[PDB]
Symmetry: D3
Subunit: 94 residues, 6 copies
């Protein structure tokens, strides 16, 4: 019969830059071995966050350039915001 099933892969990228500050941005090459049949959907979020109250909390995360073979794990803060340590989590299913 015809049915719906999803293949999923997931992981966590961790960043501990303290005492140093974590970079404005960061991009990681995440690959799916083996590739998917079609380009899956991916969502990213935070599992651990270390933000200084001396400035507004501005943390953005995302999956950019999603290829059936992998995707770019993207993170960035902006303006005067300062991030000390942070863990990203992502899950891509199809």
């Amino acid at each position: 019969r015809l049915i719906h099933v999803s293949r999923c892969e997931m992981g966590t990228s961790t960043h501990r830059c303290w005492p140093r500050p974590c970079d404005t941005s960061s991009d990681e090459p995440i690959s799916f071995w083996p590739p998917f049949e079609n380009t899956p959907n991916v969502i990213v979020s935070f599992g651990m966050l270390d933000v200084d109250n001396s400035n507004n909390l501005r943390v953005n995360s995302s999956a950019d350039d999603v290829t059936v073979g992998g995707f770019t794990l993207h993170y960035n803060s902006w303006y005067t915001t300062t991030v000390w340590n942070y863990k990203l989590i992502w899950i891509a299913c199809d």
Copy 2:
């Protein structure tokens, strides 16, 4: 034989309000196509968060009124808090 397998859907919903503050609360109808054969589960979180340090960080997000047809992507803040931008993420499996 019998096996376990899930069908998962997933999406994001970006709310950029700056220079205006984001609505205190938000509810968006999300539709599943095609409908699940049985009610699915749904977890919601944040992929991007921009909140003013002028006050405590009070952000809530959920999936209310879930069914086989879909759910309501609910988000809200409370008290004297202020959010300039935020991205909600969700995933629903069965």
Copy 3:
């Protein structure tokens, strides 16, 4: 034919503490019913969060001792940070 498919179990854990500050750390055992063929993968994030601006934001979370029958839903803050309410969300797939 040989294919890839998954089984995803997921959920949420709400911790309301205000007016009492939430515990520095909190562990919660989760059970997979029935058990997975093999050891799944879990990722935990936040779905709600209430953090005091009087200090930096320091929230961490993870899935510990993940077995075919369950994992431990871990939460913790550190140092001077304070938390009033929060919701954890996790999802596992094989």
Copy 4:
């Protein structure tokens, strides 16, 4: 994603009659259990056969009144044929 996967059920049914000839036709209700989700196809054939050369070889078999919960395994012969033994084999997938 969408995939095509089938569930199959299959069985044999031996009929030994000799020294007596097997009855002109024979019907036997088969039960799928648990029931099927869709109404499946079924094909019947012969795994063993013992027929008399004294006449032509006239044998017929078929799945009948197929539900999502079973069907009638049917066998028969017409006219002057004489069958001494036979085993029906059947397979039903979806």
Copy 5:
């Protein structure tokens, strides 16, 4: 996770020729909608048979030119044989 599942298709082709005798051979086009990811395996047999004892029983059948799109349901006899009526059954799975 990696599992083995199969997709199967099946069907029958009834040939009632009496009083006329059945053609020596028959090749029928069977197609698959939609086609397989990869080329299936196919097997054929007889569901009903009507062979004249005046001569030896000789029946052959097979799936020819099998591809992801379908195949050719071939049937034939040879030499002195005579077949009055007959049905073929086939099932393909990948």
Copy 6:
């Protein structure tokens, strides 16, 4: 979700003895690579049959010694029957 899926395997062994008559019995060992998770169901039938009319048609076939790793492809005739050529077909799903 819980669903039903079968994994199948199939094949056909041919035997061309004319003018030599085919042995009374034959047993071919079949392997299942990779080995089913749990013991499968097998069914065998005739894809090509060539029998001399000078005696009753007595043919039999089956799958014996069925294990998750394989099975034995059994075939025989008995008493006065004489078989010149024949082909067996088998399909085993779990």
